[PDB]
Amino acid sequence: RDRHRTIVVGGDRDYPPYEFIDQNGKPAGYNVELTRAIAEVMGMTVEFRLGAWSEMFSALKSGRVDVLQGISWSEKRARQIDFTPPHTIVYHAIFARRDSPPAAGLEDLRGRKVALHRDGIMHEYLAERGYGKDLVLTPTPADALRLLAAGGCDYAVVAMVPGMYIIRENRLTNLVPVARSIAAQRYGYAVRQGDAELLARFSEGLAILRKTGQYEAIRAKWLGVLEP
């Protein structure tokens, strides 16, 4: 009916290990497992619709999906959607080819060519700092890392964990994370502004998973995934 009305879950089709469509064409990842677990304790029915990230924010407001299982919090962002508490903290890192000159911080990236996720927290963050001219935008963080690997740019800034997972999966073995633990993010579910029902439905499920131990059980599965 209303509570039995299938909840449609949006997410990025290419953001491992948090969320991604796997080789078998199946929704997979930490977020997915978390969402399925929540659906189970809250008695919800969910449909996963993972897609290009450049349109999931829209689709939330557009109502094409009812919630996003994995999105980083930000002021500009809170002004249009409501976030539940976060289920994880996402650190970023600066990646470079091994040979290349190391950088100890993102200020050292001024004047250098830099790849990064199209409109992710770091895109916005480095734009607001005059980097925009010296930076290439990619559909996925992995595309950013491929360009770096291919000597197609000088550095890349992407979420640490996905970075490592991507380096392994796509065999970008000339890449190393040089500048680590910089710019931590609060990552979690989010629903359309003023949808306190759904919002509370998810927050409660998350809170429940944390008190029963299922949350940590799921998190321990995905190495490197941190908790708030």
Cβ 71 to Na ion, closest distance in Å? 12
DSSP 172: -
Cβ 82 to Na ion, closest distance in Å? 4
Kind plus residue range of the DSSP H or E element containing 210: helix 196-212
Closest to Na ion by CB, 80 or 181: 80
Q: Which residues bind Na ion (CB under 5 A)?
A: 78, 82
Closest to Na ion by CB, 35 or 84: 84
C-alpha of 225 from chain center: 12
Cβ 35 to Na ion, closest distance in Å? 20
Closest to Na ion by CB, 116 or 191: 191
Which residue minimizes CB distance to Na ion? 82
Cβ 193 to Na ion, closest distance in Å? 6
CA angle 10, 13, 14 (to 5 degrees): 135
Closest to Na ion by CB, 51 or 85: 85
Distance CA 100, CA 201 (A): 48
Per the listing, tokens 């996963």 go with 48
Closest to Na ion by CB, 82 or 108: 82
- Do the beta carbons of residue 8 and residue 65 sit within 8 Å? yes
Describe the strand order of the beta sheet including 67-72 as a list of residue ranges: 46-51, 7-12, 67-72, 175-192, 81-97, 155-159, 114-117, 135-138
Cβ 78 to Na ion, closest distance in Å? 4
